[PDB]
Ligand binder design. Structure first.
Ligand SMILES: NC(=O)c1ccc[n+]([C@@H]2O[C@H](COP(=O)([O-])OP(=O)(O)OC[C@H]3O[C@@H](n4cnc5c(N)ncnc54)[C@H](O)[C@@H]3O)[C@@H](O)[C@H]2O)c1
Ligand SMILES: NC(=O)c1ccc[n+]([C@@H]2O[C@H](COP(=O)([O-])OP(=O)(O)OC[C@H]3O[C@@H](n4cnc5c(N)ncnc54)[C@H](O)[C@@H]3O)[C@@H](O)[C@H]2O)c1
Ligand SMILES: [Zn+2]
Ligand SMILES: [Zn+2]
Ligand SMILES: [Zn+2]
Ligand SMILES: [Zn+2]
Lengths: 373, 373
C-alpha cells in the first residue's frame, strides 16, 4: 500500500489515564507487513496491566489491545500468504517458521521478533502510528484498539471468512490459552480428575478443554461465587470456594479425591494459589500447570518432597499452540461446534464507550467484553 | 524357618553415637517374609542422616543400612518366589504389584507397607531384631548392617547368582536412582545437552545414564574439584566449579550453551542449587530433575515466568524403577557390560571397622564404601 490512512483509535497517552479516543495516521505496509482493518476487539486483564502503569515494561503512549479480528486492508512488499480482503486474526506470539523455537515441536515461542515487539516498534525499529505529530508505540505486535493497524507478516493467522468476526477474535488470547492448557501442555487423559483454580475466562477454556479431552471430574475453584454457575455450565462437575473452609484449600481438595487431583491448572496469577494448586495434585503422578501470569518479583515455592514424591510442575503460553498453524484450526473447531466461543462474550460495547469495558472488568462481571469497532 | 539365629550386627543405640558392633537375635520368618544372609553392604549419605539424629523421623535403636546383597537363609509361610539359596537384593521401595501405585505405570511408589516400614517394624507391627532383651527397630525395610536380616515378601529382588555380591549391592540405592533419573524420569533424547549438579555417587550414575541415553554434552558441576576426574571419566565432557566465578552459576551455564541446557539434574540436595539448576535450563523446553533429598523445611522457589516460558520441574525416587521388576534387569545390564558398577566402590572395609565408612564419607573421599560382612 502507499496511502496513509487517517482514522479513529483509542490512544493511551499516559499510564493511569482513561483511553482517549483519537484520530491517528496509520502509515502503509513496509516490506513483509500487513495493514489490518479491525472489525472487533475485546478487552483482557492483560491490557489492564499495561494501562495500570504497574507493568514494569510498559512504554507509553500506546494503542493497546490484542484480541482482534478483521479484514486485510492491504499487504506490503514481499508478502504472498495474504491479500486485500482476506479474513484474519492478529497474534501476539508469531510463528516465523524457521527460528530455533519455531522449528522445534516442544514449544511455540517464536523469538524472531521478540526484541522489536518489546520496544513497541515494527520489525524495523519504527512505528506506523503517528498522531498529532507524536509517535504512538505499537503494543504486543497487534494494536487492535485501532480502526486500522499494522502487523508483521508472521503475526497474522488467516481464517474462515464466514467466521463471526465479533466472536472469533476471542481466540487471540484467553480461549486458546486455556484450551491448549488442557489439550497441549497437560495432554490430559480420558477419565482423569482435574481441578481449576480461577473461573474467569482462561479458566473456562480449561474446563472446556478438560471436557473435550474427556475428563471425569472437573472441580472449579474461585473466591467469587458468581463464577460458579457458568463453570458448572461449561463442564465443572462441582465448584468450591476457598473462603468457605478453615483448612487450607489444598487440604480440602485432597480429602475430596482421597489422594489428590490428577491434573490441576492455576489460572488466576496468584503465587500463593500456585503452590496451593501443585500441592493438591496426586502423589506419584500428579501434574500442575501454571496458566496465569504473575506480578514481577512474585515467586512460587514449595518443599522439593512434592516433586520427589512424583509431581511435575509445568507452565504454558498461548496454551501451546504454534500460533499461525493453530488459530485457523481452532476457528474450524468453533464452526463445527466442537468448542464453545460465544459463551465467553458477556458484554458488547461500541468503540466510543471503550473505557466502559475496562470498567466492568474491575467488577468481576465480565468474562470477555467484546467491542464492535 | 523356626530357629532364632543369634549373630553379629552394627546396632545404633542412640543418635549421634558410633555404631556399636553387637550380638543380636534375629527371629525366623513370619508369613510372607524372608530372612536374608547379608554378604556385603555399603554406606550411604542416607544412613548418615538417621545416625546424625537430624532425621526428624529417626526412631532408635536401629540396625541401619539399605545397600545390601545376599543369599536367602530361609522363607516364611506363604512365600513362593524365593527359596533358601536364592541370590537376592533387598529394596527400600517394594513392589507389592497390586496397590493403587503399583498398578499404574506412572510411578514406582508402592504404598502397601509405607506406614509399618516407617515405624521400623515388619508388616505386622513387630520387629525381628531382639538384643539383650531390648527391641531394635528395623530400618528402611532392609536393615543390611546385620549378618542376618528379615525383609518382607515384596522387598526382595531375586538376582543373577554369579553376580559379584560385593558390587551389585550398590544397585539398591545410588546407582539405580541416578541411572533412572536420566533414563526413566527425564527420558533424555539422543543429542541433548545436559548438566549435572553434584558429582558424588548419584550424580555419576546420571552422567552414566545420559551417556547410554546418547547425550551430546554432559556438564558436571561441583564445589569440590577432586570429583572432576571421575566425572569426566564417566562421560562428562566438561566440569566446572561454581566457586570459580563471580556470576551466579545459572548465568555461567547459560552463556556456555547460548540459551541453556536441555536437561539438568540436581543431585546434591541443596535448595539453592535446585532453583539454580532449573533456571539454567533452556527456554521453551528445558526440563529439570530433582534427584537429591533435602532437609526438612527447606523449600525450593523461583519466579513462575520460568515455567511459563516453558520449563518443566520434575523430581524422582529410585530413578523411577518399579523395584522388583527392574533391579534384576539392572544386574543383567551390569553383567553384559552395558553399565558400570565397580567404578563406584572407592573403598572396601571389614564389618568390624564399619564406623570407618561413615568416617571417609565425612571427607568427600568416597563415592561408595563397600563393606564385606
Ligand atoms: N500464560 C499465558 O499465556 C496467559 C495467557 C492469557 C492470560 N493469562 C493470564 O491468566 C490469568 C487469567 O486471566 P483471565 O483472563 O482468565 O481473567 P480474570 O481476571 O477474569 O480471572 C480472574 C479469576 O480468578 C479469581 N481469583 C482471584 N483470586 C482467587 C483466589 N485466591 N482463589 C481462587 N480464585 C481466585 C477471580 O475471582 C476470577 O474468578 C491472568 O494472569 C492472565 O494474565 C496468561
Ligand atoms: N531421591 C532419591 O530417591 C534419592 C535416592 C538416593 C539418594 N538421594 C539423595 O541424592 C543426593 C546425593 O547423594 P550422594 O549419594 O550422591 O552422595 P554425596 O553426598 O557424596 O554427593 C555430594 C556431592 O554434592 C556436592 N556438592 C555440595 N554442595 C554443592 C554445591 N553447592 N554445588 C555443587 N555441588 C555441591 C559435594 O561436593 C559432593 O560432590 C542426597 O541428597 C541423597 O540423599 C536421593
Ligand atoms: Zn487478552
Ligand atoms: Zn520463529
Ligand atoms: Zn544408600
Ligand atoms: Zn504396591
Amino acid at each position: 500500500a502507499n496511502e496513509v490512512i487517517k482514522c479513529k483509535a483509542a490512544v493511551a497517552w499516559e499510564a493511569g489515564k482513561p483511553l482517549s479516543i483519537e484520530e491517528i495516521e496509520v502509515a502503509p505496509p513496509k516490506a513483509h507487513e500487513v495493514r489490518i482493518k479491525i472489525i472487533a476487539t475485546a478487552v483482557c486483564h492483560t491490557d489492564a496491566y499495561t494501562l495500570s502503569g504497574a507493568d514494569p515494561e510498559g512504554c507509553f503512549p500506546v494503542i493497546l489491545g490484542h484480541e482482534g479480528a478483521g479484514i486485510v486492508e492491504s499487504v506490503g512488499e514481499g508478502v504472498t500468504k495474504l491479500k486485500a480482503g482476506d479474513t484474519v486474526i492478529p497474534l501476539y506470539i508469531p510463528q516465523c517458521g524457521e527460528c530455533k523455537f519455531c522449528l522445534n515441536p516442544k514449544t511455540n515461542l517464536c523469538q524472531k521478533i521478540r526484541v522489536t515487539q518489546g520496544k513497541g516498534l515494527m520489525p524495523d525499529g519504527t512505528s506506523r502510528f503517528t498522531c498529532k505529530g507524536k509517535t504512538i508505540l505499537h503494543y504486543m505486535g497487534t494494536s487492535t484498539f485501532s480502526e486500522y493497524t499494522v502487523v508483521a507478516d508472521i503475526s497474522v493467522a488467516k481464517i474462515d471468512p464466514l467466521a463471526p468476526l465479533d466472536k472469533v477474535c476471542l481466540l487471540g488470547c484467553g480461549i486458546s490459552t486455556g484450551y491448549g492448557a488442557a489439550v497441549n501442555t497437560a495432554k490430559l487423559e480420558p477419565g482423569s480428575v482435574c481441578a481449576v483454580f480461577g473461573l474467569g475466562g482462561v479458566g473456562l477454556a480449561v474446563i472446556m478443554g478438560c471436557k473435550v479431552a474427556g475428563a471425569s471430574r472437573i472441580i472449579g475453584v474461585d473466591i467469587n461465587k458468581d463464577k460458579f454457575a457458568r463453570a458448572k455450565e461449561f463442564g465443572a462437575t462441582e465448584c468450591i470456594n476457598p473462603q468457605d473452609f478453615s483448612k487450607p484449600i489444598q487440604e480440602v481438595l485432597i480429602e475430596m479425591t482421597d489422594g489428590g487431583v490428577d491434573y490441576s491448572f492455576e489460572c488466576i496469577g496468584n503465587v500463593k494459589v500456585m503452590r496451593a494448586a501443585l500441592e493438591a495434585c496426586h502423589k506419584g503422578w500428579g501434574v500442575s500447570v501454571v496458566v496465569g501470569v504473575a506480578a514481577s518479583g512474585e515467586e512460587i515455592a514449595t518443599r522439593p518432597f512434592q516433586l520427589v514424591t512424583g509431581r511435575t510442575w509445568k507452565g504454558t503460553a498461548f496454551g501451546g499452540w504454534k500460533s499461525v498453524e493453530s488459530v485457523p484450526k481452532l476457528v474450524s473447531e468453533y464452526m463445527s461446534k466442537k468448542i464453545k466461543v460465544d459463551e465467553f462474550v458477556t458484554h458488547n460495547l461500541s468503540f466510543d464507550e471503550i473505557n466502559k469495558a475496562f470498567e466492568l472488568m474491575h467488577s468481576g462481571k465480565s468474562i470477555r467484553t467484546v467491542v464492535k469497532i
